[PDB]
Design a protein around this ligand. Structure first.
Ligand code: CL
Ligand code: CL
Ligand code: CL
Ligand code: CL
Lengths: 116, 116, 116, 116
């Protein structure tokens, strides 16, 4: 249902990154970042149900992944604490966006898979 | 001289990412992001002279790399427009931080190399 | 069914990497690389049915992804032509391995997700 | 002097990957991989002096990085044991190749920077 999905992996332990906090913001008319959607990744490392086609309108979006809470519960104090990426949602473009991310204490990688 | 350095690479063309705008922010007491330092990468993809040991105090820092202006001048309209990473500078930790980044239209990777 | 799965993504076009040739080798007693399994990624970028629990015994495995044929059909002549990674399968370890890969003309990234 | 350089980083500890064994092979006329050059990364994570312009002729090259010996001495038993990438050296192309790599126990990333 959700045209925005987030999937997070762990490069140190070779696993889905479970219980990772993900926050999505949408740029408002005044150019502030408005809270749009948020959630936590499941046991699969996937975060479903973030939003819907009705709510996910055209706009500039920021996807933030908080790595601090995640690493600490696994006994790690990371260097990279959060990572954020910004993109524009455009109705002419294909309709499902998957933001994949890979976490390590000193490294962050993300790739967008845009389908349909 | 600068205890913070940024180096940016291009995954599509296999080159240093030249003339990439980099902005650094430092979290203020009120928890807003204060502009701390900024610059553009050289022909080597490296950004030197960002700050000094005197100015780079302990704190939470955000490093933002704007990919839009970079890709457009190379004739590309990217999906990922900006990428940001947050870390804490701590005086007890080693004293030089190098933030390396790799750019592609739909992908972003960064790693911190912390030495001395 | 397959305890080994391969998933491939495209960093330039932001998509599953479809029709990517994947070859798996297993190190033999004489220390040569014996052809073990191979296939092509589906429209999802995923390669299923590579092997079975009966055939996927303990051993040293190499997973090779050929990027040349893939990029050319998309009109690209890449610099990185193939990428290979080696790991040991061990029965005591968890039983499903997913090798994820991200492709660009001058860059290659892979991460293993080992579950169950 | 060397038109081929290799630089290796560590994503777990946020450092240059020091004393990493790097092996380069060149495809022979019979299509076997002939040992071409090898070395170990310095304290900077860089491997200089691999070859020379006279020896580095046109051909298909494989760059292998052995991660097992590296991780073990740091007290880690990695999943990814080696990673290899293949490219063609072509005299018409620019003349310096830098192969950068990023290591983690379950992840490997590499990018080529081709200059001059
Ligand atoms: Cl969903
Ligand atoms: Cl400097
Ligand atoms: Cl399957
Ligand atoms: Cl040299």
């Amino acid at each position: 249902m959700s045209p925005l999905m987030v999937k997070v992996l762990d490069a140190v332990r070779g696993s889905p990154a479970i219980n990772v906090a993900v926050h999505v913001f949408r740029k408002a008319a005044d150019d502030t970042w408005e809270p749009f959607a948020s959630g936590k990744t499941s046991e699969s490392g996937e975060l479903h149900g973030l939003t819907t086609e009705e709510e996910f309108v055209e706009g500039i979006y920021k996807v933030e992944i908080d790595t601090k809470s995640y690493w600490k519960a696994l006994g790690i104090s990371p260097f990279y604490e959060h990572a954020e990426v910004v993109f524009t949602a455009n109705d002419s473009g294909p309709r499902r966006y998957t933001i994949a991310a890979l976490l390590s204490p000193y490294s962050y990688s993300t790739t967008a898979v845009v389908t349909n």
